[PDB]
Design a protein around this nucleic acid. Structure first.
Ligand SMILES: [Mg+2]
Ligand SMILES: [Mg+2]
Ligand SMILES: [Mg+2]
Ligand SMILES: [Mg+2]
Ligand SMILES: [Mg+2]
Ligand SMILES: [Mg+2]
Ligand SMILES: [Mg+2]
Ligand SMILES: [Mg+2]
Ligand SMILES: [Mg+2]
Ligand SMILES: [Mg+2]
Ligand SMILES: [Mg+2]
Ligand SMILES: [Mg+2]
Ligand SMILES: [Mg+2]
Ligand SMILES: [Mg+2]
Ligand SMILES: [Mg+2]
Ligand SMILES: [Mg+2]
Ligand SMILES: [Mg+2]
Ligand SMILES: [Mg+2]
Ligand SMILES: [Mg+2]
Ligand SMILES: [Mg+2]
Ligand SMILES: [Mg+2]
Ligand SMILES: [Mg+2]
Ligand SMILES: [Mg+2]
Ligand SMILES: [Mg+2]
Lengths: 199, 133, 233, 187
RNA sequence: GUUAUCCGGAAUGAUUGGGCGUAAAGCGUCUGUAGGUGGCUUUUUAAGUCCGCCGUCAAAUCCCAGGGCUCAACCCUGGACAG
């Protein structure tokens, strides 16, 4: 139920995928054969948009679908609400607080019970995070060690204003619901919605 | 002349499509009211009454041609809804609104004829005579 | 600004009458006035307002620097147009009108290129070194090119104002200016539809006198407007 | 009066030859062309089948300006190009709303093609079929519902869509026509 | 993945939403019984129609708002538009 395949590959075809890999792709070396499909059918474009989404967050299709139904239910702008829903996922908030290298790493972390949400152990990746929520490391040696070395040795300070981090205990705090400009990727949600008109 | 309302509406539509300002219509309480309303909405320039041999004719001036007769971006549409074969009624919450409200809907209700706007203020439903674009 | 018009002069030149009642277009029924002996009589109180607005826009368009065409292809209106256009210093069409003069510019202009080469040839005196067939042929080219390109041969670029005589016969001019986004200021008799021109002046067809009256009024507007564009640039 | 040769050579130098000057000026027009359909039509002659391509192509800025065009040639490229020009001279503007959608719900009729457009809530994207969808997408309409009823032919549906979005009346203008303040019709 | 069943797309049985000169389609033409619709003006009545209030249309399901199984599916509380 998880994508264990080659990453760099999907990266080449789709685009830049933060939640997958930090290693920039090879020059691509496809300039020899110069093989193309010609151009892309509108369908291929839309499909690659969705694929972008799905592979950035580590989600399975059938899951994405029900997320989309939740989305179409919610009262408001569809694509936006969808992106909210995808961005409040636990391994994702774990990643975007830099408590992890990447999303597979963060998923692994969550899964092995190394994390706490409001002094409670949640080992499932898709746990939906809600406002005013405490993201902690479990108090054991190994959990602390992982979170520390993955937090400190990664210099990036981008924290997108709904996310707080505090230094010694390493208490992560989810402050609020995401803003559409604060989203974790460059995507026209319009395209993914249009793809999903047929379900 | 099985239906008078539809007839008025129709004569208007025909005179309009032919780029003529002037129409003769036969008057009646319904007719007169409908035309009054049509004026306070601003769909028609001016109205007046004539009499001969105990017949009443409302003549209607119509809004001028759009910046020529040939290049017309806009026409003026009328549609009968409730007709003798099927009578359409609506409660307060089903009251129709045309093109987001740009046009209007004519209602015959307990308090008389009116637009859908008046029905919404006063909270009444009723019989829908026509739609006007 | 004012112009020279009164009920008496328009009564003089014979503008008020037009073709028989078998021949009429009821599309003109709103602004017509009377009918006499099966000869229609057209409203002059509309004619003065249209002729005023026409000379006004003609004045503004001359003053801003826009370029003018005039058209009629008739026998009398042609002799009147060469002189109307010379008196206002404008471009004209009198002789046979070629389809595509406005709409198809590129080929019309290459036709002008070669007509210019012909105008240099004939004055250079290099048509005397040729066989008789060559000079007769170059003279066909000349005769034709003079007929069609005679009055427009100064103009480079697309004319943005066109003036026309009797739109019944002039159909292609009307079509081409309708197409290219050009205003038409036109003469209407009782047979013609008031769709085809931007400003359509009720007028007379058969009369050389009406043509001369309204065209002299208009060429006077273009002349005073010509003084104002000699001043403003 | 300056000489005729130098001034006519000035109008000859100002209008450039088509054999000595190559052409790509088009991206300076600020437009994008999208090829909707490529078909091989045939005229038949005593020799055999005389093959041509017909291209249906729409142009837009994706900013609220759009047009359709149709072209014919021997080669794909040339017909594409002609289509481009025919479209550019045929072009019009679609009335838009602050959220990038239609003023209201509308039908349209061209030939056997009928077209149904209705406004949408922001975030719904453009949902429609090929001709209608490309036209609307190239106009830049972000949220729109549409369904072509009647026929399926690409070209006619395009033209019908244009007929639809051309007759669309924006609220300011119905306020001005009726002679009534905006807020009164809002209610 | 394949096969079967049903609705969709199908405006392809069409109230919303189609047609009948030549594409499938106007009875060969009238007279007329049931049946359906039917001019204008004033009054009456209140059967339809419209508005308010009440009773009920079981619980479970669907919809909205919270709560509980680590999450979800599932379960629980409260409430309601329709009609
Ligand atoms: Mg494989
Ligand atoms: Mg569907
Ligand atoms: Mg009811
Ligand atoms: Mg050709
Ligand atoms: Mg049809
Ligand atoms: Mg279909
Ligand atoms: Mg299966
Ligand atoms: Mg069906
Ligand atoms: Mg069938
Ligand atoms: Mg059929
Ligand atoms: Mg047959
Ligand atoms: Mg048959
Ligand atoms: Mg028969
Ligand atoms: Mg038969
Ligand atoms: Mg029989
Ligand atoms: Mg009978
Ligand atoms: Mg009977
Ligand atoms: Mg009865
Ligand atoms: Mg009655
Ligand atoms: Mg129940
Ligand atoms: Mg819930
Ligand atoms: Mg819960
Ligand atoms: Mg319940
Ligand atoms: Mg009830």
């Amino acid at each position: 139920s998880r994508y264990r395949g080659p990453r760099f590959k999907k990266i080449r075809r789709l685009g830049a995928l933060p939640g997958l890999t930090n290693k920039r792709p090879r020059a691509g070396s496809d300039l020899r054969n110069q093989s193309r499909s010609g151009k892309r059918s509108q369908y291929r474009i839309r499909l690659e948009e969705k694929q972008k989404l799905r592979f950035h967050y580590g989600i399975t299709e059938r899951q994405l679908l029900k997320y989309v139904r939740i989305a179409r239910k919610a009262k408001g702008s569809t694509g936006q609400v969808l992106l909210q829903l995808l961005e409040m996922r636990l391994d994702n908030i774990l990643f975007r607080l830099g408590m992890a290298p990447t999303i597979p790493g963060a998923r692994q972390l969550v899964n092995h019970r190394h994390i706490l949400v409001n002094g409670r152990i949640v080992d499932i990746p898709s746990y939906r995070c809600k406002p005013q929520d405490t993201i902690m490391a479990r108090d054991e040696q190994k959990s602390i060690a992982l979170i520390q070395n993955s937090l400190d040795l990664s210099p990036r300070e981008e924290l997108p204003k709904h996310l707080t981090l505090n230094p010694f205990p390493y208490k992560g705090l989810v402050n609020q619901i995401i803003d559409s400009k604060w989203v974790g990727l460059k995507i026209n949600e319009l395209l993914v919605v249009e793809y999903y008109s047929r379900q | 002349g099985k239906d008078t309302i539809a007839d008025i509406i129709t004569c208007i539509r025909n005179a309009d499509m032919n780029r003529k300002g002037t129409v003769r219509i036969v008057s009646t309480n319904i007719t007169e009211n409908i035309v009054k309303i049509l004026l306070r909405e601003g769909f028609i320039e001016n109205a007046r009454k004539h009499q001969e041999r105990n017949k009443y004719f409302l003549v209607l001036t119509l809004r001028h041609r759009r910046n020529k007769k040939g290049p017309y971006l806009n026409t003026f549409h009328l549609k009968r809804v409730s007709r003798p074969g099927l009578r359409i009624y609506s409660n307060y919450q089903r009251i129709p609104r045309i093109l987001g409200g740009m046009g209007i809907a004519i209602l015959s209700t307990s308090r008389g004829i009116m637009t859908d706007r008046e029905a919404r203020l006063e909270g009444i439903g009723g019989e829908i005579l026509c739609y006007i674009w | 600004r004012y112009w020279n018009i009164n009920l008496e002069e328009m009564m003089e030149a014979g503008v008020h009458f037009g073709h028989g009642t078998r021949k009429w277009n009821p599309r003109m029924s709103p602004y017509i006035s009377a009918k006499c002996k099966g000869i229609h009589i057209i409203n002059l109180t509309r004619t003065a307002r249209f002729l005023s607005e026409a000379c006004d826009l003609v004045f503004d368009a001359s003053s801003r620097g826009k370029q003018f065409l005039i058209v009629g292809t008739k026998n009398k209106a042609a002799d009147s147009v060469a002189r109307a256009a010379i008196r206002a210093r404008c471009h004209y069409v009198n002789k046979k009108w070629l389809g595509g003069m406005l709409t198809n510019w590129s080929t019309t202009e290459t036709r002008l290129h070669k007509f210019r080469d012909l105008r240099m040839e004939q004055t250079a005196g290099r048509l005397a070194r040729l066989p008789k067939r060559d000079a007769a042929v170059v003279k066909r080219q000349l005769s034709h090119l003079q007929t069609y390109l005679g009055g427009i041969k100064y103009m480079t670029g697309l004319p943005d104002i066109v003036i026309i005589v009797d739109q019944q016969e002039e159909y292609t001019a009307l079509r081409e200016c309708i197409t290219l986004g050009i205003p038409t200021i036109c003469l209407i008799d009782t047979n013609c539809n008031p769709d085809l021109a931007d400003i359509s002046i009720p007028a007379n067809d058969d009369a050389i006198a009406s043509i001369r009256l309204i065209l002299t009024k208009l060429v006077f507007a273009i002349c005073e407007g010509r003084s104002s564009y000699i001043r403003n640039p | 009066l300056g000489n005729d040769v130098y001034a006519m050579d000035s109008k000859i130098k100002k209008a450039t030859g088509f054999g000595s000057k190559s052409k790509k000026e088009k991206i300076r027009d600020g437009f994008e062309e999208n090829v909707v359909q490529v078909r091989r039509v045939t005229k038949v002659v005593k020799g055999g089948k005389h093959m041509r391509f017909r291209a249906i192509v729409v142009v837009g800025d994706k900013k609220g300006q759009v047009g359709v065009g149709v072209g014919k040639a021997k080669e794909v490229v040339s017909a594409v190009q002609k289509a481009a020009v025919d479209a550019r001279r045929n072009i019009i503007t679609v009335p838009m709303t602050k959220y990038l959608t239609f003023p209201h719900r509308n039908e349209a009729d061209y030939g056997a093609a009928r077209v149904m457009l209705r406004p949408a809530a922001p975030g719904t994207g453009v949902i429609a079929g090929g001709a209608v969808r490309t036209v609307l997408e190239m106009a830049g309409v972000e949220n729109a519902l549409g369904k072509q009823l009647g026929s399926n032919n690409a070209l006619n549906n395009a033209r019908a869509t244009i007929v639809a979005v051309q007759t669309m009346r924006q609220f300011s203008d119905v306020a001005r026509d009726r002679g009534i303040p905006m807020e009164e019709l809002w209610k």
